[PDB]
């Protein structure tokens, strides 16, 4: 065929996929075959989770990561997040799984039977890495596809049932979004917020109106940018600051996926809006705040005056002030006073936690929720023993948030290493010394000594 | 010539696994040490010496299996199979911890045989014996930790047991009782180990990124010939790079590789000296000036006083189960505890 | 040329005794700021309330510390993850009481170290060499990110970040073991194999090259003078070194390709430290080491203790004593 050998390509077997940089036909089959593997896992994992799913117990007690994504879109759940129909979970799994066979068929064909190069078959699908016009056009096409995808989430929230809203009155329910936030001061205000405590950058979005409004903006921006890059070519300043090669383009996207991986880690760790705690379990801050409220209710029922109860250090045993004065929970959970949750906000007034509402308005469902989230804190061992590292074997539990946070931090880190590796090599190969130093022309030998 | 030169010829024949005179000591001792550990971690318990399970047969996994030390009542007994304790009974010999001394003693002589193997091969090949000299560091560590340290204590019981989790307990024991992290001889060992790993990474990365282009392919490994006279990487470019990045750099390739020997070997020798001190409870546990001030001033607090509180919690909560022969009965009211926890 | 082009030539110049570069334009001011603040704080900073319970911990030399016990103390737990620059405090006295210097130092340091890694690529490009030295440095850099930034984020407070001191580091290691059982975590075990193995191979490669040096000097002079800086010929016999080590074990267990050997010396400790950096980073989200507490029981149901149960008794002792005044509720959830 072509290459498939060290002497014919220059790369060894352990770097054999690099023999496809100039073979556009087989490279297309690789991306399409790998795309089939992604859809396969999505379909297969969903069917696995459904077969092992028990509706009488919460999702976060069953090690589910994909079903909570479907429930958040408003399928199969009713008020309070309780599952009422498992058939939409089955449909998503089957359609993704069946679609992987189509992508698998095309990936095997384009990589084994199809032409190894597309430049001689059709001038539209053929491409060269140096062609700055064709590259931007392919980028513009995929930008449009990404734009329509973000609008699919908007159409679902506004025209096809809506989304699950953990902030809806009554303990959460599926709600249709009729007034998306279009104000740019609110949408782009998130991008300018600090990533530190009490601000949280875009991770702090706490209402569906801002979520669906942002995807309207992103949808239009991608489609507008897609049209832009199809009709234009990179300017002079852009074509002098970038390396234009296949490996260089890969390195740019590796940095991007790494960046997105770190952001997703914090999203699943802190955000309880697009990751409802009814499905994924409580967050770290949430469970720590729930413990303070649990024993607040406990001791107050026994007659304790939680407002005037001085603690051992001099700070309040139950209630204290934040650095800016807000009445917050006491103890080590003072660090988590930025937490906001539907079971806690009814107790907040203008100055923070309202002592009168604490002494009169605590409901049984709030005591219930706090006890549930306190005893489901996202702490567990590698062999899925729930609780602190000193707990005995008994509870088989590790929060899905811990699984989703740890896994994507590992992947994000290695993709950052991937960026560094492939970006450094792209510079060296483009300059012509990625294979070593020329003995007859060593640059340092032609430089003046440092001293 | 006699049978000695005949045997010498056969022992030094070039075979797939070189034997030599040192093999007469190395191979049986290394095999019995290795086979003793695998036999114990598979079938042998620690129930009568420690009150612990420690074999696959009892339900332990790879992390929890161990060949545990003999009971404290055995003192420093050699625990010979034919000795007065086991009296030739193989079963009782296992139940009393005889495999620990079996592994430690045969292992000690196996290390001697291996170092002699380094001497014997170096002489026949004709090179300098610096590899044998470097192996003195693991020997000093083994001898100090597994032999000198328990010999200074009450019995073999307080030596490290041959196991993954058991070695971890050994680490935590030295923090709560010896404050071993505070010992400057361990700190010098840490710098030698961490410094050694730094030198290893930075030297291999420097060579692999200063290579000469001696081949045409993208795989640079093929562009090398073990019989070539020229260097395979540029010392001049490597010196220029590190002189501008870090300020200083190597300029002598022979000093560089000797330094790679010196750092890890010296580090291990320093920590071996510290362990010899701990054999006699000669610890660097406290700073007297800190204790006098903290005793009179209840507002003086440092990370040093915070760590001693942790060591005190380790000792009280661990000792009853870790030293069962002492019959430590600590009532709940006497255990040191912070608020709530 | 104009003023801008002449400035660009000086920044990227290969004739400067110390290379600057564009990464150096950020690295130099941030590292100087972190260094200057660290020296002043380590010597003269007043005690700071690390745990947010009005219990200041003395860290500086002038307040009764020595080299071993001194530290720059992490910022207050009442601050959490909030950004606490100088201009956000009512006064420098408030800033000093709450651990302000800690944030200034770690933030300027982590940024200057990030540009230090990028500076390693930049000079490698200006000199025409291969660029992957910075990849090897990413392993210690990722480790510093874990203990200074990643672990505070997962726990919600810079008060649980590693202190800037010798004894403070030991306090970080002990509390980490009680709350995560890091010894029983495979990533730390892989990190131990990375640092143990790295030190082994360092002494190994050093001894084998030293053993096979070609005789070029006299017995009354150092053998290092047998190598001249810049000489073309190699200074040792790798075939003799291969012949010795190949017989110490067996033939196929020894390297004869120097490029393959030196790549192995780089891969082993770097990959091992990547794992141990990821260990701290994943344990920041409470995915802890193996828990085998009470895993072995007898026919009746009595617990049969293992060495893991003994480790747990030690962990309990660290747990109930750490921050003895900061907990009001039974579970230490963060």
């Amino acid at each position: 065929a072509t290459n498939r050998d060290q002497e014919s390509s220059g790369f060894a077997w352990w770097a054999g996929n690099a023999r496809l940089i100039n073979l556009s036909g087989k490279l297309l089959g690789a991306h399409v075959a790998h795309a089939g593997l992604i859809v396969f896992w999505a379909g297969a994992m969903t069917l696995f989770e459904l077969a092992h799913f028990i509706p009488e117990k919460p999702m976060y007690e069953q090690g589910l990561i994909l079903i909570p994504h479907i429930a958040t879109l408003g399928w199969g759940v009713g008020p309070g997040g309780e599952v009422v129909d498992t058939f939409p979970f089955f449909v998503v799994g089957v359609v993704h799984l069946i679609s992987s066979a189509v992508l698998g068929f095309g990936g095997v064909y384009h990589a084994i039977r199809g032409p190894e190069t597309l430049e001689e078959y059709s001038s539209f699908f053929g491409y060269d890495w140096k062609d700055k016009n064709k590259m931007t056009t392919i980028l513009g096409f995929h930008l449009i596809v990404l734009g329509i995808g973000a609008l699919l989430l908007v159409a679902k929230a506004m025209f096809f049932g809506g989304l699950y809203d953990t902030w809806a009155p009554g303990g959460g329910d599926v709600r249709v979004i009729t007034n998306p936030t279009l104000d740019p001061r609110v949408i782009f205000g998130y991008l300018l917020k600090s990533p530190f405590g009490g601000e949280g950058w875009i991770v702090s979005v706490n209402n569906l109106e801002d979520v669906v409004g942002g995807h309207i903006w992103i949808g239009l921006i991608c489609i507008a940018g897609g049209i832009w890059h199809i009709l234009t070519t990179p300017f002079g300043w852009a074509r002098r600051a970038f390396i234009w090669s296949g490996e260089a383009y890969l390195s740019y996207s590796l940095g991007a996926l790494s960046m997105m991986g770190f952001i997703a880690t914090c999203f699943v760790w802190f955000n309880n809006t697009v990751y409802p705690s009814e499905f994924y379990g409580p967050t770290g801050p949430e469970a720590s705040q729930a413990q303070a409220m649990t024993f607040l209710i406990r001791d107050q029922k026994l007659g304790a005056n939680v407002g005037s109860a001085q603690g051992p250090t001099g700070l309040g045993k139950y209630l204290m002030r934040s650095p800016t004065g807000e009445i917050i929970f006491g103890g080590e959970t003072m660090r988590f006073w930025d937490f906001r949750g539907p079971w806690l906000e009814p107790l907040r007034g203008p100055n923070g936690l309202d002592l009168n509402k604490i002494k009169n308005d605590i409901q049984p469902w709030q005591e219930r929720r706090a006890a549930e989230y306190m005893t489901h804190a996202p702490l567990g061992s590698l062999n899925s023993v729930g609780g602190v590292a000193t707990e005995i074997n008994s509870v088989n539990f590790v929060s899905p948030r811990s699984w989703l946070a740890t896994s994507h931090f590992v992947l994000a880190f290695f993709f950052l290493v991937g960026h560094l590796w492939h970006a450094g090599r792209a510079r060296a190969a483009a300059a012509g010394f990625e294979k070593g130093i020329d003995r007859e022309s060593e640059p340092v030998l032609s430089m003046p000594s440092l001293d | 010539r006699g049978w000695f030169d005949i045997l010498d010829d056969w022992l030094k024949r070039d075979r797939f696994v070189f034997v030599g005179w040192s093999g007469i000591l190395l191979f049986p001792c290394a095999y019995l040490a290795l086979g003793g550990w695998l036999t114990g971690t598979t079938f042998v318990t620690s129930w009568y010496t420690h009150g612990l399970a420690s074999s696959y047969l009892e339900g332990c996994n790879f992390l929890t299996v161990a060949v545990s030390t003999p009971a404290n009542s055995m003192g420093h007994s050699l625990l010979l199979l034919w000795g007065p304790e086991a009296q030739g009974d193989f079963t009782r010999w296992c139940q009393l911890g005889g495999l620990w001394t079996f592994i430690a003693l045969h292992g000690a002589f196996g290390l001697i045989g291996f170092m002699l193997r380094q001497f014997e091969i170096a002489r026949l090949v004709g090179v300098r014996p610096y590899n044998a000299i470097a192996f003195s560091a693991p020997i000093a560590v083994f001898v100090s930790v597994f032999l000198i340290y328990p010999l200074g204590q009450s019995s073999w019981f307080f030596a490290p047991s041959f196991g993954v989790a058991a070695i971890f307990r050994f680490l935590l024991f030295f923090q709560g009782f010896h404050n071993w992290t505070l010992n400057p001889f361990h700190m010098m060992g840490v710098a030698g180990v961490l410094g050694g790993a730094l030198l290893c990474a930075i030297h291999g990365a420097t060579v692999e990124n200063t290579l000469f282009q001696d081949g045409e392919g993208a795989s640079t490994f093929r562009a090398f010939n073990p019989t070539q006279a020229e260097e395979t990487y540029s010392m001049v470019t490597a010196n220029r790079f590190w002189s501008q990045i870090f300020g200083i750099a190597f300029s002598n390739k022979r000093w560089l590789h000797f330094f790679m020997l010196f750092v890890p070997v010296t580090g291990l020798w320093m920590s071996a000296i510290g362990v010899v001190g701990l054999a006699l409870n000669l610890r660097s546990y406290d700073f007297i000036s800190q204790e006098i001030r903290a005793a009179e001033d209840p507002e003086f607090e440092t990370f040093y006083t915070k760590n001693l509180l942790l060591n005190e919690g380790i000792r009280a909560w661990m000792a009853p189960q870790d030293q069962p022969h002492e019959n430590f009965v600590f009532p709940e009211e006497v255990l040191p505890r912070g608020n709530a926890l | 040329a104009n003023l801008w082009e002449r400035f660009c030539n000086w920044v990227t110049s290969t004739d400067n005794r110390l290379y600057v570069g564009w990464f150096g334009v950020i690295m130099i001011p941030t590292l100087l700021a972190a260094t200057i603040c660290f020296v002043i704080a380590f010597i003269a900073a007043p005690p700071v309330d690390i745990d947010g319970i009005r219990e200041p911990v003395s860290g500086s030399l002038l307040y009764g510390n020595n080299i071993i016990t001194g530290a720059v103390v992490p910022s207050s737990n009442a601050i959490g993850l909030h950004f606490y620059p100088i201009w956000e405090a009512a006064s420098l006295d408030e800033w000093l009481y709450n651990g302000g210097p800690y944030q200034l130092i770690i933030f300027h340091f982590l940024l200057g170290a990030s540009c230090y890694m990028g500076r390693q690529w930049e000079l490698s490009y200006r000199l025409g060499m291969r660029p992957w030295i910075c990849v090897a440095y990413s392993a210690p850099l990722a480790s510093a990110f874990a203990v200074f930034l990643i672990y505070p984020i997962g726990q919600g407070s810079f008060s649980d970040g590693m202190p800037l001191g010798i004894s403070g580091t030991f306090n970080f290691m002990i509390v980490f073991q009680a709350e995560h059982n890091i010894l029983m975590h495979p990533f730390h075990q892989l990190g131990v194999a990375g640092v143990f193995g790295g030190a082994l191979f360092c002494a190994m490669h050093g001894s084998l090259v030293t053993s096979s040096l070609i005789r070029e000097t006299t017995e009354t002079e150092s053998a290092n003078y047998g190598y001249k800086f810049g000489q073309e010929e190699e200074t040792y016999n790798i075939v003799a070194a291969h012949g010795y080590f190949g017989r110490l074990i067996f033939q196929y267990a020894s390297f004869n390709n120097s490029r393959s050997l030196h790549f192995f010396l780089a891969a082993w400790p770097v990959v091992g430290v990547w794992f141990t950096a990821l260990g701290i980073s994943t344990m920041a989200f409470n995915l802890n080491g193996f828990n085998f507490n009470h895993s072995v029981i007898d026919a009746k149901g009595n617990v049969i203790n293992t060495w893991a149960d003994i480790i747990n008794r030690a962990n309990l002792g660290m747990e109930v004593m750490h921050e003895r005044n900061a907990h009001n509720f039974p579970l230490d959830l963060a």
């Binding site: 001293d451 | 001049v236 010196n239 200083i248 300029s251 | 020595n66 800086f229 810049g230 000489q231």
Partner: peptide, 30 residues
């Protein structure tokens, strides 16, 4: 007394860094 000793040793190390870099033995290619 102790503080002055600790700082004095540290300052000498910083001065040694200056000479070891800017006043080193210049590497010469024979």
């Amino acid at each position: 007394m102790e503080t002055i000793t600790y700082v004095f040793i540290f300052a000498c190390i910083i001065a040694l860094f200056f000479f070891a870099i800017f006043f080193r033995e210049p590497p010469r290619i024979t």
